[PDB]
């Protein structure tokens, strides 16, 4: 639902990946201070979110990811269909978001089909841990039932209306 998905993108917004504009200056600030002080470790932890099906699958089956946002409208759906079944087995929480265009704008691209959460900030772990029980209630714990749930198979409205009109005639037959 969109209230959780807006809270999720609020959390993922400050973990935005590096763009080529800020990649120019980030290699400057590393190099101007190394030219001035030679820092042995200036930044111990730059945190970021990963992107890409082929990168996420490496993180889940190594159990390095902490929450796997997964998209909805992948055109060859077999690119993604294994991944909910796999996050159950490695126990990583996953959530299906609406629209692969919208999480593609997080990573400054068009479509990106998956992102992952590995190292959140420890002061903002408490926002990631807030909605993660709201998520693995809905996806991981329900896996015995969401694997059973068939889809489709409803007739069209011009043909289910004549179903109801036969049932009302059967309802008018009895009383």
């Amino acid at each position: 639902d969109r209230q959780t998905a807006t809270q999720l993108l609020k959390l993922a917004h400050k973990y935005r990946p590096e763009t080529k504009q800020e990649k120019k200056q980030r290699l400057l600030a590393r190099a101007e201070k190394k030219a001035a002080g030679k820092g042995d470790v200036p930044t111990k932890r730059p945190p970021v979110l990963r992107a890409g099906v082929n990168t996420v699958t490496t993180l889940v089956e190594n159990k390095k990811a902490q929450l796997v946002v997964i998209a909805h409208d992948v055109d060859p759906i077999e690119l993604v269909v294994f991944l909910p079944a796999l996050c159950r087995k490695m126990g990583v929480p996953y959530c299906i978001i609406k629209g692969k265009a919208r999480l593609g704008r997080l990573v400054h691209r068009k479509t990106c089909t998956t992102v992952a959460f590995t190292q959140v900030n420890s002061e903002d772990k408490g926002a990631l841990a807030k909605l993660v029980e709201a998520i693995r209630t809905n996806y991981n714990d329900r896996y015995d039932e969401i694997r059973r749930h068939w889809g489709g198979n409803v007739l069209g409205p011009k043909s289910v209306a004549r179903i109801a009109k036969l049932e009302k005639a059967k309802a008018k037959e009895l009383a």
Binding site: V53, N54, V56, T58, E61, D75, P76, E78, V81, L86
Partner: protein, 203 residues
């Protein structure tokens, strides 16, 4: 990580998931043209194990081929020869259908060079193949010296000569005791060497 799962999921194409989306789109493919330019590969693992990369210059076409063997194009089934040549209706066309499918893809686009292709659905009448093509004159292809081989002019129209892995299966060549009907060069290059009279000068 991803593509090993996509491979193994594809290799079971009778299970209820996979035989659904192999025919929810075999319908969708059937409604289009005989050949149609796909914007992106419909199975990106199998394209890239056949030589595809996702950059400017490569292009996929899915094209359609009508299934079945060939009928001998002869008026009223009258072939006018000895009775071993009354073969109107059991004739089988010794080159493959995928090699036919690559052939009428690189024929429409003669500015394009063809690498190879793969299978994306079959109905009872039509059979659908995605054919991958390469523009020899784009600078992402004309640089990158591990790609410069195809822009070298001996590779003009590779399937009309039978050079791709779909098409080279029909020539019957390879090493072995099972394949030395073509043990020099090609099939008729063996025949010319077996049937030449090699009379020397002092004989």
């Amino acid at each position: 990580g991803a593509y090993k799962y996509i491979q193994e999921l594809w290799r079971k194409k009778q299970s209820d998931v996979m035989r659904f989306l192999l025919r929810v789109r075999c319908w969708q493919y059937r409604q289009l043209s005989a050949l149609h330019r796909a914007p992106r590969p419909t199975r990106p693992d199998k394209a890239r194990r056949l030589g595809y990369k996702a950059k400017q210059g490569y292009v996929i076409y899915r094209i359609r081929v009508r299934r079945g063997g060939r009928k001998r194009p002869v008026p009223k089934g009258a072939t006018y020869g000895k009775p071993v040549h009354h073969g109107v209706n059991q004739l089988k066309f010794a080159r493959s259908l995928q090699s036919v499918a690559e052939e009428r893809a690189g024929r429409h686009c003669g500015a394009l060079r063809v690498l190879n292709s793969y299978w994306v659905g079959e109905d009872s009448t039509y059979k659908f193949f995605e054919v991958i093509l390469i523009d020899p004159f784009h600078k992402a292809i004309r640089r990158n010296p591990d790609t410069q081989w195809i822009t070298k002019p001996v590779h003009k129209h590779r399937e009309m000569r039978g050079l791709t892995s779909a098409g080279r299966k029909s020539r019957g060549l390879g090493k072995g005791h099972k394949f030395h009907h073509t043990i020099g060069g090609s099939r008729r290059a063996a025949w010319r060497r077996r049937n030449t009279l090699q009379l020397h000068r002092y004989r």
